[PDB]
Design a protein around this nucleic acid. Sequence first.
DNA 1: GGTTCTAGAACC
DNA 2: GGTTCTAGAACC
Lengths: 99, 101
Amino acid sequence: HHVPAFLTKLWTLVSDPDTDALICWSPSGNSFHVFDQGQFAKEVLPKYFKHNNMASFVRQLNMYGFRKVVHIEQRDDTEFQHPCFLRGQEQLLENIKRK
Amino acid sequence: HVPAFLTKLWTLVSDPDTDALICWSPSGNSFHVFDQGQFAKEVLPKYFKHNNMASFVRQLNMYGFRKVVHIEVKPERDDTEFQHPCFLRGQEQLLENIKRK
DNA sequence: GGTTCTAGAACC
DNA sequence: GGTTCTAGAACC
Ligand code: NA
Ligand code: NA
């Protein structure tokens, strides 16, 4: 099936080293971080996910079955992941499904 | 030398006979612990005998495991998901790369 | 179960 | 060779 532009855009954005101050791969490449959501919403969303806020962006991640990664024991930092959303493996996006 | 905690955990997760309480995720990238009260009663005494649930989870944290949660209806039993990029179904040799953090 | 002891590894 | 770290065993 055709890979949703949402996922391709998201993957390219994460993978761009120049955006890493706001969104980047984890060291393992298995997850990605979103930093400083106040800034992320002003700088990033308007250009790559037009007419979105953080809530609608995160709703889309949930729709594609992304999970959140948190520390077991307790800038803002939120970590998301999908087993087919991986550093340097864009072709795996094909295996991501709605719901 | 891989710490016994990690080798025992990997074997325990992998064992189909314990899957009602502890098992791999479908992808093999994470494991689930179900029904922690029962896990503490049936599993910990046999596999991690000097531990309680708190110390078991502390050891996971010490080795850099994280928790996986849904982006936000209660399930029949509680379900906690843990993961480490070197703790994977079918890849026990990767435990060699797990370090204290 | 938490703390202490120590052999041996990790790292320089 | 010297220092720190770590895992397992004893001690509480
Ligand atoms: Na980036
Ligand atoms: Na199991």
